[PDB]
């Protein structure tokens, strides 16, 4: 069905952007820069450690949730 | 930037949703059913007359949108 | 849980915006002006009759559904 | 006009969502639990210390990028 096939396609491209290693690093380097919004050299360092450590895990979580589009658009009742 | 293909694709596939002659019938029948929520036999007819006449005009006007990404995807976060 | 708490809050606050009578006329004048897009003195008059009669009903129906966020976010299944 | 009035309304209420002190704590408690997605008493604690400290900073930019929808919706081609 067309609203299911489009939703599946959109979800597929969201997967393709999150797998893009340049996009993976853009968010990483962005949240690294976010840490510098507080001058604290110890907290900005600890922030960079947390960001660098958790974001690849979080991206893996979203990639694992963006896989199998049929199960995503179904949980949107856009599919059967 | 690459996410501009997303803005292009989402708009393009949504365009194919409105351009789908079958989807044009799906949206019509829901707004037709909306007319029957009032028992007035004169108003239910007049609503169907307005819906059958105006909705294709509304779809075509909105079809006039989403046609060219240059005036919609331009100057936002996904292409600039 | 947060995905439920956000959904409930968004639907509840958007509902109260739709209950704010200023929002009703904002939408109303668009559909009233929409009636002038077909040069039909009987249908453009009838269009306002359909718009002025059905839009307050439809807004009240949607306002009536957004009054209970529990049944709306359940229609997103995010609270289960 | 509705494409401008929608952006003005959405940005204003989206701002009001982040301004809600219940939403302010809910985002923390989700990200606090997010730190527990890595079973580490040393790193998850350092994450919780970072989360409680930086989340108010993140809200400030987004609130600041919502303290006037008219100047943002205009630079998105949505108003003028």
Numbering used by the authors:
A (entry chain B), B (entry chain C), C (entry chain D), D (entry chain A): 1 to 80
List sentences quoted exactly from the publication behind this structure.
Saposins are lipid transfer proteins required for the degradation of sphingolipids in the lysosome. These small proteins bind lipids by transitioning from a closed, monomeric state to an open conformation exposing a hydrophobic surface that binds and shields hydrophobic lipid tails from the aqueous environment. Saposins are required for sphingolipid degradation by lysosomal hydrolases; in particular, SapA acts as a co-factor for the enzyme β-galactosylceramidase (GALC) by solubilising its galactosphingolipid substrates. Although individual saposins have low sequence identity (less than 35%), they adopt a common fold consisting of four amphipathic α-helices.
Here we present the crystal structure of a unique tetrameric assembly of murine saposin A produced serendipitously, following modifications of published protocols for making lipoprotein nanodiscs. Four SapA molecules in an open conformation form a diamond-shaped assembly possessing three orthogonal two-fold rotation axes. This symmetry is not perfect as the individual monomers possess small differences in the conformations of loop regions and the C-terminal helix (RMSDs 0.8–1.4 Å over 80 Cα residues), resulting in non-crystallographic symmetry of the tetramer. Each chain of the tetramer interacts directly with the three other chains burying a total surface area of 1210 Å2 for each monomer, representing approximately 20% of the SapA surface. The equivalent dimer within the tetramer structure is very different, possessing a head-to-head arrangement of monomers and substantial direct protein-protein interactions. Comparison of these structures suggests that the tetrameric assembly of SapA is not compatible with binding to GALC without some structural rearrangement. The core of the SapA tetramer structure is hollow and potentially solvent-accessible if it is not filled with amphipathic molecules. Considering the highly hydrophobic nature of the internal SapA surface, exposure of this hollow core to solvent would be thermodynamically unfavourable. It is therefore likely that disordered PC and/or DDM molecules are present in this internal cavity.
